[PDB]
Write a protein that binds this DNA or RNA. Structure first.
Length: 256
DNA sequence: GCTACCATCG
DNA sequence: CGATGAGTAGC
């Protein structure tokens, strides 16, 4: 079985302090995509780059303690791509791609827009620039999984408070419609939603109020999968036995 | 301190 | 509903 895990660690050093390093191994995952390193290459221990002897490739932000993504894998990728190809976004380390034969896995951290209008601007530009990348990827004819924090919930079932967030970044009409475009127009599969029609599967909870304990959550972490591979997915779960981050790791198993 | 990332209340 | 009011990681 091919087990792929996507986890926004909200700072990899912190997450390692909260037992994520042991989780990497215990999970028995073949590939682990992570977002929000909140660290630069110089700030990472070897175990944060090649955990348990896994291969690892990362893209770090230019500003310190900020963003960054990585892909860890037991198997050696025969090819690796660092960044999307657009300076504006690559400055923040939000895209890594690893190839393994006909399979490719991407670790993606899509910009949040809840901080300032400018950031929502950046996010929209990101959507514009990324859509065609997804189109081309879809057009390669290979098995591609885009793991990561898309920072966008699709439908009402994807977050507890859906009515009151229709005006907040993450659930704006244009965002939802963009995700819908990625799915129904481009043909990508939202693996969780397809595997489990009625299961909300929240993957994030705000630090405000008692959101976590109350399970007032959002499903903004995805594995977006190409058709042939999507058809092979057998199960998935959101790991909550331990809390490494404000996000929970999303685990999918594929009968490859 | 600073920066960057919507649940709850009236 | 609009108005109000935050906890966290890393600097």
């Amino acid at each position: 079985m091919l087990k792929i895990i996507s986890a926004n660690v909200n700072g990899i050093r912190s997450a390692y302090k909260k037992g994520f390093y042991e989780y990497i191994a215990a999970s028995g995952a073949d590939i682990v995509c992570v977002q929000e390193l909140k660290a630069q290459e110089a700030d990472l221990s070897a175990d944060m780059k090649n955990p348990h002897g896994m291969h690892g490739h990362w893209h770090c932000a230019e500003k310190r303690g900020y963003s960054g993504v990585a892909v860890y894998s037991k198997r050696k990728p025969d090819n690796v791509q660092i960044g999307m190809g657009i300076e504006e976004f690559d400055r923040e380390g939000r895209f890594v791609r690893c190839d393994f034969g006909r399979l490719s896995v991407i670790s993606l951290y899509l910009p949040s827009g809840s901080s300032a209008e400018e950031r929502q601007q950046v996010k929209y530009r990101f959507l514009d620039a990324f859509y065609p990348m997804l189109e081309a990827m879809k057009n390669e004819g290979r098995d591609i999984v885009v793991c990561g924090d898309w920072n966008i919930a699709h439908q009402n079932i994807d977050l507890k408070n859906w009515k009151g967030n229709q005006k907040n970044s993450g659930f704006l009409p244009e965002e939802r419609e963009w995700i819908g475009k990625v799915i129904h127009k481009l043909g990508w599969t939202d693996m969780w939603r397809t595997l489990y029609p009625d299961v909300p599967g929240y993957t994030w909870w705000s630090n405000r109020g008692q959101a976590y304990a109350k399970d007032v959550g959002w499903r903004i972490d995805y594995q977006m999968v190409t058709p042939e591979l999507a058809a092979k997915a057998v199960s998935a779960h959101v790991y909550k036995d331990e809390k490494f981050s404000d996000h929970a790791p999303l685990v999918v198993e594929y009968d490859y």
